[PDB]
Swiss-Prot record, chain B:
Region entry N-terminal MCU domain, spans: 3-93
Residues with S-glutathionyl cysteine modification: C25
Topological domains, Mitochondrial matrix: 1-111
Family listed: Belongs to the MCU (TC 1.A.77) family.
Function recorded in the entry: Channel-forming and calcium-conducting subunit of the mitochondrial inner membrane calcium uniporter complex (uniplex), which mediates calcium uptake into the mitochondrial matrix. MCU channel activity is regulated by the calcium-sensor subunits of the uniplex MICU1 and MICU2 (or MICU3). Mitochondrial calcium homeostasis plays key roles in cellular physiology and regulates ATP production, cytoplasmic calcium signals and activation of cell death pathways. Involved in buffering the amplitude of systolic calcium rises in cardiomyocytes.
Domain statement: The selectivity filter, in which calcium ions are arranged in single file, is composed of two acidic rings separated by one helical turn along the central axis of the channel pore.
The organism of origin for this protein: Homo sapiens (Human)
Protein name stated in the entry: Calcium uniporter protein, mitochondrial
First-to-last residue of the parent protein present: 73 to 183 of 351
Induction of synthesis: MCU transcripts are down-regulated by microRNA miR-25. Down-regulation by miR-25 may protect cardiomyocytes against oxidative damage in cardiomyocytes.
Modification Phosphoserine occurs at: S20
Impact upon substituting D51R: No effect on calcium uptake in presence of high concentrations of calcium. Abolished dimerization of MCU
Compartments, record wording: Mitochondrion inner membrane
Top-level taxon of the source organism: Eukaryota
Length: 55, 111, 55, 56, 55
């Protein structure tokens, strides 16, 4: 098994590399609509926190 | 005209003259994950006037569409487009000798 | 291409954005020079260093 | 190469050269039942590299 | 199989190439005879001594 693994490990970790890059650039485009909604909730929640800190 | 293969950024780039539109198109190919069939259907979907396309070894036999392209690009081949056999001669690489490659082949088939 | 041959409509954009290129719109040819990158996928053809690290 | 229109058996036969194989091809036209656009449709059916056709 | 029974389509290729077989394409039966290694001197410590000598 250790002799077979080293024969088939560098062509495996290129398929996994390109599959990771493709899943990363899919997850970023699936996240990017939710990000602009998330920033506008963390802008009211920080203005309501500076009202407490100044009061 | 002719079919040329040059290496750019470690990647093969094949420049083919197409029958219908008669301009030199260019196909850059990934040497591990692509196949013969991927290149053939990129040729076939490129200009639509190609009804038969095939790739033959220089001793007459044809390579299959599931053969990887790094196995294809070691020797010459013949690209049959629709009537015409263009003879393609890729650039030779830095390789193993013929006595070391048989030893590595025997190790790979003995494991 | 920079040399003047047409680029096929099936090549990926990561393979296109390695070098610079031309974009021909119907009267004017916008030469495009993208910024140079280092690497995204460590993938290329075979090398003698690969077989020397395999043995 | 020219485009030749001759008459055989009372029907016109037009012999035009197709681009993707560069061999001629003869089309038999029917002067009453057929139109121009069906002749251009047959001309695009015989060879798929004839994306642009016109007749003036 | 050379005895005449069919080989199901989930059998791996590596199990198939350990013996002869017959390939029927339309009506012609081609008797395929793969180049097989020995099974008498295939004691695994000797095959590992062949892999050790070659590497």
């Amino acid at each position: 098994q250790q002799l077979y693994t080293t024969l088939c490990i560098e062509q495996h970790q290129l398929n996994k590399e390109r599959e990771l890059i493709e899943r990363l650039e899919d997850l970023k485009e699936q996240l990017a609509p939710l990000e602009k909604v998330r920033i506008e909730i963390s802008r009211k929640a920080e203005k309501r926190t500076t009202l407490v800190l100044w009061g | 005209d002719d079919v040329t293969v040059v290496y750019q950024n470690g990647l093969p780039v094949i420049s083919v003259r197409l029958p219908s539109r008669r301009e030199r198109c260019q196909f850059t190919l990934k040497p591990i994950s692509d196949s013969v069939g991927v290149f053939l259907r990129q040729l076939q979907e490129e200009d639509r006037g190609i009804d038969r396309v095939a790739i033959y070894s220089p001793d007459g036999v044809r390579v299959a569409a599931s053969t990887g392209i790094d196995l294809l690009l070691l020797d010459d081949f013949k690209l049959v487009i629709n009537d015409l056999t263009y003879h393609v001669r890729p650039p030779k690489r830095d390789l193993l000798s013929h006595e070391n490659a048989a030893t590595l082949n025997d190790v790979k088939t003995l494991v």
